Design a protein around this ligand. Structure first.
Ligand SMILES: COC(=O)/C(O)=C/C(=O)C1(Cc2ccc(Cl)cc2)CCN(Cc2ccccc2)CC1
Ligand SMILES: [Mn+2]
Ligand SMILES: [Mn+2]
Length: 180
């Protein structure tokens, strides 16, 4: 596994709490990106990670004139354009709901106004995987209608092993326990 080994190499050679912080972060993001690929694979939809809203608009409505609109330059993880509806997908990997609400509020408030003016029928989807129990939670009714079952085989254990090593290595470093 080239990704585990590169994290491992970094956890082995890290000496300072600020570079440790970055490794923690990098882990949680690769754990997010891992779920995105597995999710998109199981549904057989295009995999993307951070698409600029302006780019999403132009794929779905080529004739648009961006300048005539105030488009917030958000980058949702992904989207599905069915031809009559746009599903804005963001991935999450969390035991709690707090990251989902924060993102749901952010995309509902910033993306939906401009999509209504442009006239594109849009829904905000947030798909979360609990990394401990592998259970998925979906916010988005049209998404649940298109994907009633999600047949993923998720295994987050290697990410947890790597971060636990990092947390143990810095268990007596007050500077790091604050940063996390
Ligand atoms: C899970 O959903 C998110 O939280 C998310 O997908 C965020 C991202 O894409 C960024 C990378 C990332 C970080 C941590 C984790 Cl664990 C997973 C992915 C990259 C884009 N970046 C937009 C941004 C940047 C600065 C301030 C405000 C927004 C956010 C982090
Ligand atoms: Mn993202
Ligand atoms: Mn995401």
């Amino acid at each position: 596994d080239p990704m585990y080994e590169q994290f491992l190499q970094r956890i082995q050679a890290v000496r300072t709490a600020t570079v440790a912080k970055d490794i923690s972060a990098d882990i949680l993001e690769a754990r997010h990106d891992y779920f995105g690929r597995e999710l998109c694979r199981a549904l057989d939809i295009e995999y993307r990670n951070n698409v600029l809203l302006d780019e999403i608009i132009l794929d779905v409505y080529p004739g648009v004139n961006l300048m005539e609109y105030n488009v917030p330059h958000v980058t949702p993880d992904n989207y599905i354009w069915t031809g009559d509806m746009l599903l804005i997908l963001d991935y999450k990997v969390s035991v709690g709901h707090d990251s989902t609400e924060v993102t749901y509020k952010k995309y509902t408030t910033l993306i939906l106004p401009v999509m209504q003016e442009i006239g594109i029928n849009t829904e905000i989807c947030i798909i979360r995987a609990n990394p401990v129990t592998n259970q998925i939670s979906i916010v988005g009714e049209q998404f649940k209608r298109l994907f009633p079952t999600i047949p993923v085989e998720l295994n987050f254990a290697r990410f947890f092993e790597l971060r636990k090593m990092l947390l143990d290595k810095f268990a007596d470093d007050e500077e790091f326990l604050m940063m996390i």
